Design a protein around this ligand. Structure first.
Ligand SMILES: *C(=O)[C@H]1NC[C@@](C)(O)[C@](O)([C@H](CC2CCCCC2)NC(=O)[C@H](Cc2ccc(OC)cc2)NC(=O)[C@H](COCc2ccccc2)NC(=O)CN2CCN(C(=O)OC(C)(C)C)CC2)O[C@@H]1C
Ligand SMILES: [Mg+2]
Lengths: 235, 195, 222, 231, 233, 240, 244, 211
């Protein structure tokens, strides 16, 4: 055995690089950013059909203008969400305004690397943080346990991510409507999901400037799934 | 706060507590319950410094409820009283002591005995046939010394209490807006709905 | 026994126009019956088109302004060079003041600037962080002399429309920067005549969307 | 090999492997160039994107009105060190009404990085920094390395293929050292330097990050449309 | 919370066309007892700054130690310690102001009134005051204790506003200072005849004069004063 | 104090101490929860290489957290007592501050949060325990059943099992539980619970424990006699 | 640093066992046998001494049987010194309860707190567990006569008859065979000795290798007496049951 | 002067708009009602800073509750956060007289009185502040459970006007709120400057004053 804060000969932190492996084993999460809003979708992956799928909370509200989807050891995400919510409400208490999406992400990532011999290990979960602010409009951020965060027009994390990202790379253009982006997330999820996509084993959400972060109930998502098959069958 | 009384009769403990809550020259409320059920067969009435009274009662209530759940068993009134005394005895040498006086009325199911405990904010405990905190005692102790009999029924106990409230409404300078009365017996705790 | 507080006198005054705002202060600094300085500025450009004065105990005033200027500098760093709106500044200063609730900053604080709609804004604070937005406010030694004059001449209080039999009020309307400066110069010359801690110099900071301009005027030195 | 398990262990040849592995993270980092005249100091950084759909990582951070740095390696480590430097620049201001000398900034970074290289359970910083500033003694460029070694230079470069730009600046020395009272010319000589470290790719408009500080120039960062002028 | 024990009285100072002058007497009082008669209360810091201190002497001796330690720390890893990175009067003042305000805020003041006199590297006159409360102010004339009551009115007749500074020579300004020290000796019961005076000039640098004496005192009229009203002899 | 990171990542991205904590759950006596239309039933295996057991005084495998919430578990008995104590304390603390008993989801989320904290704190090993938490939210008639495991993940289950041969009894529940039609009565629900345990248990002698929780803090532990009837009724309905 | 020398006393094996708990139990399996038998009218505690020397002071010694309060006693199997740390803790804990509630501590509550301390040493702090198993014999007004055991794992269970230390597998077979529920204390005494007589690794069971204690109602009407037997009192009981 | 009362048509909340610095009138146009959420109101009386700081803080704690529980906080829970906070500061010299007024489905329309002594009372009628006794006098002698929304709004307005007149430390304007099952509805600012003369004339009251 050997220290938790040790560098590899290649110049990477062992414990960080190993956490990245744990995230690859996670259920899929996809986000897409447009001028009409940001869409967040996830694979629920119920381990058994006795488990009540609606109790699988992998898309989570941080504030009215900031939502968050997770992939990996999802229990590790609880304290990250708790910190993010406190940081957003606290900012609003100190400054009578909405926290910037980047500033909230930077706050979450400042937790990431405070482990060692502070918490005992890095987080084994990646986050897609999606939101809107007046300064830089609609934004999607990938927040890793390295303490790094990237902004993306679209991003996939979890098991199906290499396949999903190559799919997003072609499909994304700068004038996607919110509708198109919803269908695109549904389409790419059904491709990389082991079992067959329905309103019970996959969940959609968006954040708009007008109506903030909303999780879609299974009725609305079931209609987008029915809509998706009609576009596909008709080419 | 001000008025809290207790009479232990043959088969019950009766707690009478004033309904008035006053700040300055305003009666803010005239229907205040100065009582918490600690366990199904144990009731605590309280009087003293604003805020401290409720905070103390509810803290004690939480601790007795926790003990009940943990041991699936109800603490004897003697045990609850000793716990409460020790908490007050601790508080009095604290940074800011709890300024709360309490009566504990309980029915011990093992002995089949009603028990009344009077405890002041210093943690001074006594077991009493009848008790009072504050100015009330200056009228009620001598009155009960004369009229109280050890073998009285619950109905006689309530009549003895009417005497006490009548006397306090006659001679006390402040309007305490009547009392809420509660009986603790072998069947638990009930409140008399008009007095 | 050691008294941690003192009174450095002086008086401050803020007024909000439609598309401008002023924060005026006398440049006199006193303790007891002595003049420390005839020109010690106590109205400061704090960046992001916010001007601030903390009048009263000078030491506590300088401490607060320093901490706010520092607060603005870190807001830029921590929030990608974003402009600190006057409302957000106001709320920040509440927290600065309320931090020392049990050993307060002995100052009356006024900030002036433009709100996020480009309108003139004035916020004023008690020593322990209470605050409210208002069209105008005076602070410090001569507050009690100047404030009722501002109520009358800025908000047209107790003024009625001639020959309406006291039923139609004089109509509230925004003042020109030229008119606001007349009221400020007259507020201070009146304050100087009647208050011993007010005099020497008047310094005015005017805030428009084009930035912070400064005007200065001699006052009676007695 | 057997002596690389922690920062508190010397190798038989007297090396600290955890520090050398830290130094390795910089080598893997995207290239950044620093260079200075007598009047101005410029940072040019190549920003690296995750893929075609991602933002380009910020390389340059402002520390005060007169001081800033560029990073190569672990970005969070740069955030910690830059935050520490912001605080030291602040402290100098509030307490002494004194803008912090770039030389003292260098010494303070060195001593902060050093503590981590001598104590158990810690780790060396995994980032290299180029610090530019204009203080009371003119324009300065500093090279920081997580070993604790800080170096004052006319110019340098760190990160991937940095050797190219570092040789060019060594050749150009006498030209750029005298671009005095010309901002645009020092920037273009910086852009020319970084171009020696490019392969199978050249400078685009959201690829390139430039910072300048000088006599009558606050430390300011040019990104996106405001660097099109310089490609 | 303290009470001052051994104390020094007025420090007085003013700006002139090129530099600043500062002066203070050499007495350490112990209440009404004029206990110590060789106490330097002007402490020079480099060749561009003099710090004049009044109030508690034990606290003054602490501040001396802080300043000589500051010059040391500034020289550390500083090749330009005697050049562009030398201590400025404004640096030294802001440090003392910071300490004074922290100590009052801990309810444990340094029981002193301080004037920092000097010339900045850019040739600008520096003159600023700080006291036990952390209160700070600048003026063309500054003084502490009785100085504020009796010295300022006389010095302000020479330099009344900013525009008077270019018109004031070091001859005129030093004359005003020496005269003001004589008045304080007449009228301050905690003052002494022996004083130090320092000129910081942007051309001639730091001139420090020790063992000055108040001279040309008017006392002769005393012989004509008999009794307290009606007494003739 | 003792500082070591005991729970850390391996190259394959696993945390072996969490995974080995799940092995302790696997080795624990079986436990099943089944929620009816109007009730939840908790059923627990009791390992049978012990007679001279004094079951008057031996810790019961189902624990009341509040008067409306019960918790059962599989894994290390000692570890379980620590979770139960914290849960009981948090139950009373919620009543004191929110003036309302905990929802079952809230109590689960708290216990799950404790287990998770012990996966990334220095000087501690994870809890060798998975829990079934069952009951009724205050003034709510909809039945609740949640599972927690050493990692700290939790979720809601129509019915679920944990411990040794849980794979065997989950198999049974998966084909014997209709989502569209829960056991409509207490009677029906207890039967499906005992049936599921009889795949794995042995004789249903001193071998099966059942607790029934109904709305409004109505929890009753079944006794040998009552259980034994369900056992004899199940076995004489078997002869096909 | 120091990590290199850390045994990690609080980790799981790949099979989800606590190494140090398992090895502590292995340690306890070599300790003198202790037996608890609970009758309807009292409890017996019998324990076998780690082979005595002819020169050990027999009467003044207490290796095995310790008084926790007036109503509760423990038999010890394992490291004596470890047991004494836990016993002084249990004695204090009983006195804290009496001080707080003015009532003698219920037997289970005391047992649960000692078991919770043991548990702690297996989950945090990176120390070795206590190499001790206890048989608790006690009486309270709620459950009457009670027997419990606790072991290094911090697990505790209630018993009608139980053994700890050496040859428990043998002892538990003989107890399971001859124990009846109606049994009186005098029969339980005889059972305890007959059981040690057969499972002992010695040639013969003699008074000077035995610690013996009863908790009866054998004083004055509904009040409980603890008896720690003197050498002579054991020697007499050894003859009356016919083992010498 | 602040007041809140329960009636058939929900809750009426009425406050004055004056801030004082001893006998100096600091402001005539100050907000004494904090809108915590669309179904929750807080009234402020006492220390201006103490009230503003801790009641906006209460709004932060109420937002966090609905994030972690996906449900609006109960009036009981919201009041008990503020009462448990001030109780921690007891003896430090906080000065706060607050009413937490709101509607939740489980509670119905609820008013809690909370003060800096740590007193927390559920009740149907409260008046808090220097001018409480003046407000009580008018409110108590005209109050029925069956007041129409229109009448109850006026009584609330008239009770604050009463206090504004007699109490030297109350005045400026009346700010009115109505709380229903659908949440709070603002019923406007009413300057005493105009309201007094209009009420005198239309009601025929205030015959103590030179008309
Ligand atoms: C109805 O009954 C009505 N009565 C009127 C009134 C004014 O009493 C009030 O309670 C208002 C309501 C608040 C208005 C602002 C919105 C929030 C509600 N209360 C005030 O206006 C208070 C009055 C008050 C109350 C209690 C106090 O106990 C100390 C003091 C004062 N006003 C202020 O607090 C006042 C506001 O600003 C005044 C001001 C302005 C400019 C310069 C100086 C002052 N400020 C202060 O009192 C400042 N003071 C600071 C020092 N301090 C203190 O405690 O210091 C130490 C040293 C002791 C620590 C206390 C506060 O509304 C009701 C409903
Ligand atoms: Mg004047």
């Amino acid at each position: 055995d050997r220290g938790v804060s040790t560098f590899s000969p290649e110049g990477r932190l062992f414990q960080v690089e190993y956490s990245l492996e744990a995230i690859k084993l996670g259920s899929t999460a996809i986000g897409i950013a447009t001028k009409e809003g940001v869409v967040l979708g996830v694979e629920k992956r119920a381990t058994s059909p006795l488990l009540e799928s609606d109790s699988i909370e992998k898309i989570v509200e941080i504030d009215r203008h900031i939502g968050c989807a997770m992939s990996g050891l999802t229990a590790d995400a609880r304290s990250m969400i708790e910190h993010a919510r406190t940081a957003a409400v606290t900012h609003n208490l100190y400054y009578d305004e909405d926290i910037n999406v980047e500033s909230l992400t930077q706050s979450v990532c400042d937790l990431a690397l405070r482990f060692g011999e502070l918490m005992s290990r890095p987080f084994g979960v990646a986050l897609l943080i999606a939101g809107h602010d007046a300064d830089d409009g609609y934004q999607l951020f990938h927040a890793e346990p390295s303490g790094t965060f990237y902004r993306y027009n679209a991003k996939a994390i979890g098991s199906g991510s290499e396949g999903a990202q190559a799919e997003l790379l072609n499909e994304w253009h700068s004038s996607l409507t919110l509708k198109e982006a919803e269908l695109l997330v549904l389409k790419i999820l059904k491709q990389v999901m082991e079992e067959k996509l329905d309103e019970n084993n996959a969940q959609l959400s968006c954040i708009t400037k007008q109506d903030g972060f909303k999780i879609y109930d299974n009725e609305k998502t079931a209609e987008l799934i029915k809509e998706l098959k009609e576009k596909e069958a008709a080419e | 706060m001000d008025i809290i009384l207790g009479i232990r009769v043959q088969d019950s403990v009766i707690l009478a507590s004033s309904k008035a809550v006053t700040r300055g020259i305003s009666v803010l409320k005239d229907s205040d319950d100065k009582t918490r059920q600690l366990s199904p067969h144990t009731l605590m009435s309280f009087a003293g410094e604003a805020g401290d009274t409720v905070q103390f009662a509810e803290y004690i209530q939480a601790n007795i409820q926790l003990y009940s759940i943990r041991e699936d068993y109800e603490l004897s009134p003697q045990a609850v009283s000793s716990f409460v005394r020790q908490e007050l005895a601790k508080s009095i040498r604290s940074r800011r002591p709890y300024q709360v006086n309490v009566l504990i009325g309980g029915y011990d199911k093992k002995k089949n005995k009603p028990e009344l405990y009077q405890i002041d904010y210093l943690g001074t405990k006594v077991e009493l046939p009848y008790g009072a905190h504050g100015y009330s005692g200056f009228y009620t102790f001598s009155l009960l010394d004369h009229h109280y009999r050890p073998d009285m029924t619950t109905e006689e106990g309530l009549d003895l209490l009417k005497l006490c409230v009548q006397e306090l409404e006659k001679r006390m300078p402040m309007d305490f807006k009547g009392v809420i009365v509660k009986i603790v017996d072998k069947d638990g705790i009930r409140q008399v709905d008009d007095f | 026994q050691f008294n941690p507080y003192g009174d450095n006198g002086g008086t401050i005054l803020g007024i909000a126009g439609e598309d401008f705002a002023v924060l005026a202060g006398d440049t006199r600094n006193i303790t007891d019956y002595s003049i420390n300085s005839r020109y010690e500025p106590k109205v400061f450009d704090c960046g992001d088109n916010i001007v601030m004065s903390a009048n009263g105990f000078a030491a506590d005033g300088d401490a607060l302004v320093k901490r706010f200027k520092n607060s603005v500098k870190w807001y830029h760093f921590d929030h990608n060079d974003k402009k600190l709106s006057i409302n957000s500044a106001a709320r920040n200063i509440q927290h600065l003041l309320y931090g020392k609730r049990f050993f307060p900053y002995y100052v009356h604080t006024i900030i002036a600037g433009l709100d996020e709609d480009g309108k003139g804004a004035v916020y004023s604070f008690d020593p322990v962080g209470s605050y409210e937005r208002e069209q105008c406010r005076a602070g410090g030694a001569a507050a009690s002399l100047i404030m009722p004059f501002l109520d009358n001449q800025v908000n047209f209080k107790n003024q009625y429309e001639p020959g309406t039999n006291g039923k139609v009020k004089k109509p509230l309307k925004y003042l020109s920067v030229e008119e606001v400066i007349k009221l400020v110069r007259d507020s201070f010359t009146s304050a100087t005549e009647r208050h011993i801690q007010v005099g020497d110099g008047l310094e005015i900071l005017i805030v428009t969307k084009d930035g912070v301009r400064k005007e200065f005027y001699e006052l009676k030195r007695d | 090999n057997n002596y690389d398990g922690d920062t508190v262990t010397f190798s038989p040849t007297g090396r600290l492997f955890q520090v050398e592995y830290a130094l390795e993270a910089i080598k893997q980092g995207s290239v950044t160039v620093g260079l200075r005249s007598n009047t101005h100091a410029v940072l040019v950084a190549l920003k690296r994107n995750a893929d075609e759909l991602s933002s380009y990582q910020k390389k340059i951070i402002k520390c005060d009105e007169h001081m800033g740095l560029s990073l190569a390696g672990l970005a969070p480590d740069a955030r910690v060190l830059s935050n520490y430097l912001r605080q030291q620049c602040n402290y100098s201001s509030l307490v002494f009404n004194r803008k912090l000398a770039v030389e003292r900034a260098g010494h303070l970074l060195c001593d902060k990085a050093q503590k981590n290289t001598q104590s158990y359970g810690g780790r060396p910083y995994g980032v290299g920094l180029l610090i530019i500033g204009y203080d009371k003694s003119g324009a300065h460029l500093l090279e920081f390395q997580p070993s604790g070694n800080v170096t004052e230079l006319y110019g340098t470069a760190i990160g991937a293929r940095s050797q190219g730009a570092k040789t060019y600046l060594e050749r150009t020395l006498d030209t750029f050292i005298k671009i005095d009272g010309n901002p645009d010319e020092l920037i273009k000589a910086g852009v020319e330097a970084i171009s020696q470290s490019l392969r199978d790719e050249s400078l685009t408009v959201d690829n390139l990050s430039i910072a300048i500080v000088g006599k009558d120039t606050p430390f300011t960062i040019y990104d996106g449309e405001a660097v099109a002028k310089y490609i | 919370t303290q009470q001052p024990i051994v104390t020094g009285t007025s420090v007085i100072s003013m700006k002139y066309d090129n530099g600043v002058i500062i002066a203070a007497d050499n007495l350490g009082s112990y209440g009404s007892l004029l206990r110590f008669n060789g106490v330097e209360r002007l402490i020079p810091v480099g060749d561009n700054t003099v710090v004049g201190i009044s109030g508690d002497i034990s606290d003054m001796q602490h501040i001396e130690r802080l300043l000589k330690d500051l010059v040391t720390e500034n020289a550390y890893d500083n090749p330009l310690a005697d050049a562009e990175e030398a201590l400025e009067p404004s640096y030294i003042f802001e440090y003392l102001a910071t300490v004074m305000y922290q100590r009052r805020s801990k309810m444990n003041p340094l029981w002193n009134a301080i004037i920092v006199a000097g010339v900045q590297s850019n040739g600008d006159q520096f003159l600023r005051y700080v006291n036990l409360l952390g209160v700070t102010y600048s003026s063309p004339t500054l003084a502490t204790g009785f100085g504020a009551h009796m010295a300022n009115p006389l010095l302000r007749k020479v330099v009344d506003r900013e525009s008077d500074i270019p018109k004031t020579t070091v001859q005129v300004a030093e004359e005003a200072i020496v005269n003001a020290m004589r008045v304080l000796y007449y009228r301050d019961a905690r003052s002494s005849r022996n004083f130090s005076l320092a000129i910081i000039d942007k051309n001639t640098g730091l001139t420090f004069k020790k063992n000055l004496q108040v001279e040309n005192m008017k006392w002769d009229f005393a012989k004509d004063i008999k009794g307290y009203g009606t007494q003739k002899i | 104090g003792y500082d070591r990171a005991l729970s850390i990542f391996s190259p394959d991205g696993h945390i072996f101490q969490v995974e080995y904590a799940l092995e302790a759950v696997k080795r624990g006596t079986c436990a099943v929860g089944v929620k009816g239309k109007n009730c939840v039933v908790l059923g627990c295996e009791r390992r049978s290489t012990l007679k001279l057991q004094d079951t008057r005084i031996t810790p019961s495998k189902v624990s009341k957290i509040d008067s409306h919430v019960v918790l059962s578990f599989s894994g290390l008995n000692a570890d379980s007592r620590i979770l139960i104590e914290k849960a009981r304390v948090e139950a009373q603390s919620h009543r004191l501050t929110l003036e309302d008993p905990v929802t079952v989801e809230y109590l689960t989320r708290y216990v799950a949060g404790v287990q998770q904290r012990y996966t990334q704190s220095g000087g501690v090993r994870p809890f060798g325990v998975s829990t079934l938490i069952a009951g009724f939210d205050p003034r709510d008639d909809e039945p609740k059943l949640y599972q927690t495991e050493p990692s700290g993940i939790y979720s809601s289950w129509s019915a679920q099992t944990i411990g040794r041969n849980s794979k065997t009894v989950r198999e049974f529940l998966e084909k014997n539980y209709d989502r569209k039609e829960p056991p409509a009565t207490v009677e029906e629900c207890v039967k499906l619970t005992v049936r599921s345990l009889l795949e794995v248990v042995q004789t249903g002698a001193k071998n099966i424990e059942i607790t029934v929780v109904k709305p409004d803090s109505d929890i009753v532990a079944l006794s040998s006699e009552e259980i034994n009837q369900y056992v004899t009724q199940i076995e004489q309905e078997k002869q096909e | 640093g120091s990590r290199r020398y850390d045994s990690r006393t609080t980790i799981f094996s790949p099979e989800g066992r606590l190494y140090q708990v398992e090895y502590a139990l292995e340690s306890i399996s070599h300790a003198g046998t202790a037996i608890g038998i609970m009758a309807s009218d009292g409890i017996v505690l019998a324990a076998e001494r780690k082979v005595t020397s002819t020169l050990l002071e027999q009467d003044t010694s207490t290796e095995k049987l310790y008084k926790l309060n007036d109503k509760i006693a423990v038999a010890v199997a394992g490291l004596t010194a470890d047991a004494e740390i836990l016993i002084n803790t249990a004695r204090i804990h009983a006195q804290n309860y009496l001080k707080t509630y003015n009532e003698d501590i219920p037997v289970e509550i005391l047992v649960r707190r000692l078991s919770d301390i043991k548990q702690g040493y297996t989950q945090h702090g990176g120390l070795r567990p206590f190499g001790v198993s206890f048989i608790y014999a006690g009486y309270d007004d709620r459950y009457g006569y009670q027997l419990y055991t606790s072991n290094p794992s911090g697990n505790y269970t209630g018993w009608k008859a139980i053994s700890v230390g050496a040859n428990t597998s043998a002892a538990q077979t003989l107890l399971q065979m001859d124990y009846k529920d109606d049994m009186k204390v005098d029969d339980a005494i005889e059972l305890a000795l007959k059981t040690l007589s057969k499972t002992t690794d010695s040639s013969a069971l003699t008074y000077d290798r035995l610690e013996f204690a009863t908790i009866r109602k054998g004083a004055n009407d509904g009040e409980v007496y603890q008896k720690i037997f003197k050498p002579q009192e054991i020697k007499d009981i050894l003859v009356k049951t016919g083992i010498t | 002067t602040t007041l809140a009362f329960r009636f058939q048509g929900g809750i009426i909340v009425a406050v004055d708009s004056r801030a004082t610095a001893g006998n100096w009138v600091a402001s005539q146009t100050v907000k004494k009602v904090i809108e915590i959420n669309p179904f929750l109101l807080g009234t402020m009386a006492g220390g201006a800073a103490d009230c503003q700081f801790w009641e906006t803080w209460l709004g932060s704690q109420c937002r966090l509750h609905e994030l972690r529980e996906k449900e609006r906080i109960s009036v009981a829970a919201a009041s008990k956060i503020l009462s448990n906070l001030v109780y921690q500061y007891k003896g430090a010299g906080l000065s706060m007289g607050t009413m937490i007024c709101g509607y939740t489905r489980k509670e119905g329309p609820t008013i809690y009185y909370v003060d800096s002594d740590g007193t927390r009372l559920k009740g149907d009628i409260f008046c808090v502040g220097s001018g409480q006794t003046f407000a009580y006098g008018v409110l108590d002698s005209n109050y029925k459970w069956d007041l129409s929304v229109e009448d109850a709004l006026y009584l609330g307005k008239r009770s604050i006007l009463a206090a504004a007149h007699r109490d030297a430390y109350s005045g400026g304007s009346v700010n009115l709120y109505h709380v229903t099952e659908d949440g709070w509805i603002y019923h406007g600012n009413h300057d005493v400057g105009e309201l007094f003369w209009k009420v005198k004339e239309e009601e025929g009251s205030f015959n103590n004053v030179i008309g």
